[PDB]
């Protein structure tokens with residue numbers, strides 16, 4: 001099911017592909033980033049081609065598309081991370097068990113930002129020994145969501161008398177969402193890695 | 199969707215009570231009675247969860263490719279309290295839900311080789327009516343190593359490639375009595391046994 005615009009990977013399962021400025025693919029990511037992070041400068045943007053993460057993510061997307069009633073289930077969001085975590089995320093994706101406590105907690109899961117400026121905080125995208133910061137652009141299955149709460153280890157039930165029928169994700173604010181939290185593996189696909197500097 | 203499943207009238211989730219004395223019920227009963235013959239089986243249900251099955255079978259194919267052989271799958275037991283049964287039937291096994299009982303070999307979901315281990319009251323807690331609950335689980339144990347307290351993922355299969363991981367951890371690699379998996383969709387709950395002491 002691998003997208004036909006991916007580079008041939010030669011029976012390999014994983015590749016990072018460096019994008020070229022001037023191509024729509026690079027430019028649209030650069031614009032979405034500079035919308036809120038105009039003070040930073042992009043070193044490079046890599047497309048993440050991970051066959052196994054993509055398959056598991058696309059199965060979860062198909063299931064959420066079946067379960068929800070013609071919803072836009074998927075948002076393109078940002079995730080800042082430290083250099084030490086990039087090889088793990090590239091290969092294995094986002095693991096809630098490794099997640100940091102966010103300054104404002106809406107549950108114990110993986111946090112994704114609407115605005116690059118949030119992900120660009122040194123607390124999330126820690127500068128490496130060479131001053132480089134790292135941010136993923138991520139396809140996230142936000143689905144149907146509600147305002148979260150610090151206590152959550154899964155999304156809350158839509159109905160308290162049906163505890164197993166869950167919201168797909170939670171947010172800080174349902175009228176103006178600026179962050180989303182997901183609580184399951186393969187609910188987020190790391191699509192691009194932005195390397196950037198002051 | 200597997201053969202031994204029965205029709206679901208286009209539904210994606212059904213719990214199907216097995217008939218005592220037919221081959222499927224007899225096979226699952228015998229796996230339990232190997233170590234739990236002193237317990238009384240009230241019923242066995244086949245868990246038909248299309249989404250959990252799909253995600254599990256994807257992970258199974260991936261592990262068959264990664265390990266370059268089959269034999270990544272084992273049948274194991276998981277005792278749970280009555281309150282968690284609806285969650286497990288619909289959403290499977292969540293390492294984030296595991297309390298202080300799921301400790302010692304890592305922060306994952308624990309599966310027992312022997313039904314006797316899962317039959318302990320600390321795991322299969324008797325409900326107000328005295329009923330205990332244990333799953334028979336298809337688990338992708340794959341290539342495993344000894345676990346230790348505090349693991350959030352299995353160790354690497356070589357500290358020179360830190361991201362190529364073991365699939366699971368155990369108490370004992372030569373004679374395993376339990377397995378811990380650290381990822382969703384590595385365990386498919388196949389049967390639920392309701393039983394009493």
Ligand SMILES: CCOc1ccc2c(=O)[nH]c3sccc3c2c1
Pocket residue numbers: 275276277278296297299300301302308309310315316321322376
């Ligand atoms: C060393 C602990 O190993 C095990 C082995 C089996 C089980 C089990 O069947 N159910 C549950 S529910 C919470 C913990 C456990 C558990 C833990």
